[PDB]
Amino acid sequence: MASRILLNNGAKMPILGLGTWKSPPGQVTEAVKVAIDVGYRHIDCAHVYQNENEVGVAIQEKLREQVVKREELFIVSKLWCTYHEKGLVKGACQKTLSDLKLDYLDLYLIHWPTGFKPGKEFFPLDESGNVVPSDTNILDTWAAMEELVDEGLVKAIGISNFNHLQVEMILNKPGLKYKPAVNQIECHPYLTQEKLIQYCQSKGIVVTAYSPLGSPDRPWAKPEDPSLLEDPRIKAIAAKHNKTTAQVLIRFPMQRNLVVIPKSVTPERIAENFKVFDFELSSQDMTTLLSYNRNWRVCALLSCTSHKDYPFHEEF
Numbered sequence: 001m002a003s004r005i006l007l008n009n010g011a012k013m014p015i016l017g018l019g020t021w022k023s024p025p026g027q028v029t030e031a032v033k034v035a036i037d038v039g040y041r042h043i044d045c046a047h048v049y050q051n052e053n054e055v056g057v058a059i060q061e062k063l064r065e066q067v068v069k070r071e072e073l074f075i076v077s078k079l080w081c082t083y084h085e086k087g088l089v090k091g092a093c094q095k096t097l098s099d100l101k102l103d104y105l106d107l108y109l110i111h112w113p114t115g116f117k118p119g120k121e122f123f124p125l126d127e128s129g130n131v132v133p134s135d136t137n138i139l140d141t142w143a144a145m146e147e148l149v150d151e152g153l154v155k156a157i158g159i160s161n162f163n164h165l166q167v168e169m170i171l172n173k174p175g176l177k178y179k180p181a182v183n184q185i186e187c188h189p190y191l192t193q194e195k196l197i198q199y200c201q202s203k204g205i206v207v208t209a210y211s212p213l214g215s216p217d218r219p220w221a222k223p224e225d226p227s228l229l230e231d232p233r234i235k236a237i238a239a240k241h242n243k244t245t246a247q248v249l250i251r252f253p254m255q256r257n258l259v260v261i262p263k264s265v266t267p268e269r270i271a272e273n274f275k276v277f278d279f280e281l282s283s284q285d286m287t288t289l290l291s292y293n294r295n296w297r298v299c300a301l302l303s304c305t306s307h308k309d310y311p312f313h314e315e316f
């Protein structure tokens with residue numbers, strides 16, 4: 001298992017990163033400092049997580065402390081849906097850069113294919129509860145992303161939560177200047193994503209798997225929901241390999257040539273989750289884990305199911 005994957009912009013991306021959604025602002029600075037101390041070189045961020053300033057304090061301290069060089073870090077952030085307009089993308093990117101204390105991002109993603117009305121609210125509502133869309137389409141927002149590469153603000157651009165028709169729309173864009181480097185999608189044994197992964201990989205797009213542990217801290221969790229970390233079948237694979245269930249769930253996407261971004265703010269778990277470069281799941285184990293697919297999503301963007309660009313009506 002090599003530690004980095006080559007992207008279609010010629011840069012290398014670490015295959016294991018630290019997620020930061022739901023990491024409290026008073027804990028995430030320590031989480032990121034611990035992560036860099038124990039070997040993580042990739043941090044996954046987003047403006048909508050409301051904690052980039054605190055992530056940036058950790059990054060800056062470790063760069064100042066010469067624990068790591070900027071060229072060795074791979075920092076990812078994401079353009080939120082209320083900034084898809086051509087004239088707002090640069091300022092959104094620069095706010096993220098200012099918060100993270102960076103003068104460039106390694107990778108900047110369109111967070112969702114759905115544009116929303118600009119304004120202070122991240123989910124602007126009509127008086128009945130539906131998301132108010134933007135009329136800007138995915139192709140014009142992609143051209144604005146391409147401008148960020150040409151201005152030196154980001155080294156690579158990509159997409160997140162795009163279905164295969166939407167990836168194809170980008171690839172078929174008239175005048176396309178830069179292909180997406182990455183599609184970041186939910187992926188774990190209950191949402192195995194074979195068709196969309198195959199498609200992206202065949203096009204040279206690297207896939208990043210989010211919520212690899214099934215996001216047990218997601219806000220909308222219901223007791224009745226399936227639970228990866230408690231599934232006795234997965235616990236049995238882990239026991240056979242003398243690893244934790246989380247370590248099996250992180251190694252699984254790595255062996256599919258995916259990048260994976262488990263989140264923790266607990267120092268012991270941050271270190272445990274990185275200790276996945278020293279064992280191998282067999283092909284039988286991989287096929288067994290794939291067999292647990294049930295098309296179950298943590299993140300279904302349920303307030304946006306009538307948006308023209310809602311991604312999850314499509315079979316993949």
Ligand SMILES: NC(=O)c1ccc[n+]([C@@H]2O[C@H](COP(=O)([O-])OP(=O)(O)OC[C@H]3O[C@@H](n4cnc5c(N)ncnc54)[C@H](OP(=O)(O)O)[C@@H]3O)[C@@H](O)[C@H]2O)c1
Pocket residue numbers: 018019020021022044045111160161184185209210211212213214215216217229244246247261262263264265266269270272273298299
């Ligand atoms: N592009 C998108 O739309 C999108 C959507 C969702 C997620 N993401 C990204 O993907 C990252 C990961 O997904 P996620 O945050 O949904 O969830 P996740 O990584 O699947 O699970 C995080 C949860 O697992 C717990 N945990 C971590 N390591 C553990 C271990 N070794 N043993 C037991 N429990 C453990 C964490 O607890 P503690 O933190 O308390 O330790 C937290 O409650 C996000 O943080 C974000 O960066 C992106």
